[PDB]
Design a protein around this nucleic acid. Structure first.
Ligand SMILES: [K+]
Ligand SMILES: [Mg+2]
Ligand SMILES: [Mg+2]
Ligand SMILES: [Mg+2]
Ligand SMILES: [Mg+2]
Lengths: 101, 208, 132, 260
RNA sequence: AUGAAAUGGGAAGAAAUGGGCUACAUUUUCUUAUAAAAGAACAUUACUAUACCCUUUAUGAAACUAAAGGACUAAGGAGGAUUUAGU
């Protein structure tokens, strides 16, 4: 069991983007240029559109791995501000201390 | 402040340190020996032993500065002094030998005597009597009397001037017209004194 | 008022260990870090993966040695080796500790694919820094 | 300006361009040239110079006479033989031709000088502007180049050593220069590769700061006119201070003394 | 079904109010410079639009977003009581 149904939907989006990464790369390359005929580029614009929506990598959201919080996350640890503070304030993060200056 | 209260304000008078020991009053002599065991604040960037440094003008510059632009405010003051020196040289050359004697061509002496003329001696103050505030004429202190003269000058020029005139041209024309006691800033002094005259009845309310 | 990781005052009858007594602002001043890895150093990667392993490794040891832990465990990573240093009360018989050490080491070495060793220092009872 | 006085008193013909940076920036009227459609004409810049050139050389404007016919308009032309003053008069009268009257003047003097009639001092201050960059834009909002301008192109010929009968006195000025550093004064830095090659072989004359003798003379000159009105300026501690702050630089000394 | 999933939407204001940003210019506007100095501008659009609109680019599958230009340019002329911050 994952934290919630939102983390489950996000996990599937991440595994379908990995499957369609090469494909969406090869097709999208045909569009990001000025060297190929516009007829081919107009057609490649639809082949990329036809791929499943969850293959799109901009529908991925970084969530706290332990609480599935969508905002407030720190990308180096993948934890929300609330979870990070609990581990940091207890001496459990290696090298993280309070900032006094 | 980053200076502990034990720190002492610096003394940047060149002659004072080089005076013969016997010429110093024992009170002044005492402080020198005491200072050898005290901490001394570093001198400000605008604090120098220069013979051309005038505190009154240096203060007047800081009261014109906007947003920490010291170069511009100092430049405006330099242009003003020059605008006054050039205005008196023109008058001096175009004047008879008799008139030439009276004409003053020192801008520093026109600036100081212009400000002193504008200084107001007595200004109305709010004083509390019987849990109620009355406007009673009061003797203005030295610092408040000096501040008011400078503030009134920098405010007449900043606001009450044409759009295309510049501060070195309005300030020069105002320092010169306050060196002869016939200017708008002198009229502002005459209003403060005129109002205190009307409220002289409440003078005795002062307890000092 | 600040409520984070602060064991609050009672009436002088609450025993607290050295780790519990000190609030978060004493970290790196009076008390050190329970986990020591290289993943939070500047220009280093895999902080997230080291941090997730720590959370699990602490929950695993609490359940595997239930009621036998005198203080929080100390995790030490060197190269790919993981070292777990735990203060454990002398409640269980000696032979049971040998079983749980063999089990917990083998299980965590096949779960994270690293050599994992368990170091146990047995105390007669919890050490009390102060009564608050 | 000292050289321009010496030549002026010996009856030379002074061709003095006071500042050449004014012709490559801040132009509010920029027309096109009939002579060459590529080039542009600066009516106001040319008109101002001509009025000053007329004043300086008024005496020589009747003696010198054009050697060719110049058709200003369909209805106006200059007959060969007429005084050079007529060319100048038309330029001031009709501002459209002002940028062309200048070109005729520069061309005539350069040709006629070799005949021994008169000497010619081409004194251009700010010469580094000619072979640099401009801050003027065409109708397409594209920056112009110095060669394109009419006044700049004519002058580039006068500063060449392909004639005789006079001397060319040039000066460099980083002040007013476009796209040059504040601390650039050397000839190659200001002229560039194009300007340096154009003018060589030239004689560089370094203008230094006031020497100890010159600084005292300048200090006493200000005191002689009552300019240094501060009480402490006349003293030795004032002078030593003014020497340090100015650093004996003529301009800085004038600026520091101006406020005092 | 108050659970799970897909697709499409989640609109606007002759409105009041809080905070911010910009301007109202001459201690200013533009240009080169480097913030020094110089040349121009300087009241009807001179100062002055991070709005609307028109083009181009960047990200993305999707531009509805952001930036950069272009013109269009309206109001504003230092702000009533009152109130904020700064040793
Ligand atoms: K539901
Ligand atoms: Mg849940
Ligand atoms: Mg996102
Ligand atoms: Mg500057
Ligand atoms: Mg695109």
């Amino acid at each position: 069991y994952y934290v919630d149904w939102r983390m489950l939907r996000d996990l599937k989006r991440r595994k379908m983007a990995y499957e369609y990464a090469d494909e969406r790369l090869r097709i999208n390359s045909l569009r990001k240029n000025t060297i190929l005929p516009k007829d081919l580029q107009e057609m490649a614009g639809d082949e990329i559109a036809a791929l499943p929506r969850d293959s799109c990598p901009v529908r991925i959201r970084n969530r706290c791995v332990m609480t599935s919080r969508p905002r407030g996350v720190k990308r180096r640890w993948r934890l929300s501000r609330i979870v990070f503070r609990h581990l940091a304030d207890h001496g459990l993060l290696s090298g993280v201390q309070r900032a006094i200056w | 402040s980053r200076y502990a209260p034990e720190f002492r304000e610096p003394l940047i008078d060149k002659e004072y340190y080089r005076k013969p020991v016997a010429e110093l009053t024992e009170e002044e002599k005492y402080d020198q020996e005491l200072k050898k065991t005290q901490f001394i604040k570093a001198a400000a960037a605008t604090e120098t032993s220069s013979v051309f440094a005038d505190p009154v003008i240096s203060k007047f510059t800081n009261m014109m500065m906007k947003g920490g632009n010291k170069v511009l405010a100092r430049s405006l003051m330099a242009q003003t002094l020059e605008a006054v020196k050039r205005k008196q040289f023109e008058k001096y050359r175009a004047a008879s030998a008799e008139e030439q004697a009276t004409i003053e061509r020192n801008p520093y002496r026109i600036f100081h005597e212009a400000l002193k003329n504008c200084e107001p001696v007595i200004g109305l103050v709010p004083i509390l009597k019987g849990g109620h505030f009355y406007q009673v004429p009061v003797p203005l202190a030295d610092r408040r009397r000096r501040f008011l003269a400078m503030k009134w000058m920098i405010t007449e020029c900043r606001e009450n001037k044409p759009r295309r005139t510049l501060m070195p041209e309005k300030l020069s024309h105002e320092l010169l017209e306050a060196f002869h006691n016939r200017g708008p800033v002198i009229k502002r002094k005459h209003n403060m004194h005129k109002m205190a005259e009307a409220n002289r009845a409440l003078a005795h309310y002062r307890w000092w | 008022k600040n409520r984070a990781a602060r064991v609050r005052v009672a009436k002088g009858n609450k025993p607290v260990s050295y780790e519990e007594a000190h609030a978060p602002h004493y970290i790196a001043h009076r008390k050190g870090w329970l986990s020591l890895h290289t993943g939070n150093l500047d220009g280093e990667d895999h902080a997230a993966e080291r941090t997730l392993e720590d959370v699990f490794l602490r929950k695993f040891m609490m359940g595997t040695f239930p009621g036998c832990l005198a203080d929080q465990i100390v995790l030490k990573r060197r190269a790919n080796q993981v070292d777990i240093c735990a203060l454990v009360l002398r409640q269980l018989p000696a032979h049971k500790f040998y079983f749980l050490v063999g089990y917990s080491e083998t299980l965590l070495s096949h779960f994270y694919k690293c050599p994992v060793r368990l170091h146990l220092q047995t105390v007669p009872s919890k050490v009390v820094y102060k009564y608050i | 300006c000292h050289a321009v006085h010496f030549c002026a008193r010996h009856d030379w013909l002074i061709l003095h361009i006071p500042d050449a940076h004014l012709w490559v920036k801040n132009c509010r009227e920029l027309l096109q040239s009939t002579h060459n459609k590529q080039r542009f004409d600066q009516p106001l810049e040319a008109s101002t110079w001509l009025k000053n050139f007329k004043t300086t050389n008024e005496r020589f404007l009747s003696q010198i006479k054009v050697q060719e016919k110049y058709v200003w308009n369909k209805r106006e032309s200059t007959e060969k033989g007429s005084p050079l003053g007529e060319v100048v008069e038309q330029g001031l009268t009709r501002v459209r031709n002002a940028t062309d009257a200048v070109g005729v003047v520069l061309k005539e003097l350069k040709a006629q000088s070799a005949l021994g009639l008169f000497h010619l001092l081409v004194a251009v201050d700010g010469v580094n502007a000619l072979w640099g960059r401009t801050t003027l834009k065409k109708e397409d909002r594209t920056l112009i180049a110095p060669e394109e301008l009419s006044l700049v192109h004519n002058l580039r010929k006068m500063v060449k050593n392909d004639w005789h009968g006079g001397a060319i006195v040039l000066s460099l000025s980083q002040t007013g220069s476009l796209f040059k550093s504040r601390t650039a004064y050397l000839p190659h830095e200001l002229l560039g590769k194009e300007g340096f090659n154009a003018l060589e072989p030239f004689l560089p004359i370094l203008i230094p700061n006031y020497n100890p003798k010159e600084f005292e003379s300048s200090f006493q000159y200000y005191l002689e006119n009552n300019w240094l009105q501060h009480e402490k300026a006349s003293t030795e501690e004032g002078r030593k201070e003014l020497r340090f702050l100015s650093n004996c630089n003529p301009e800085q000394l004038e600026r520091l003394c101006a406020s005092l």
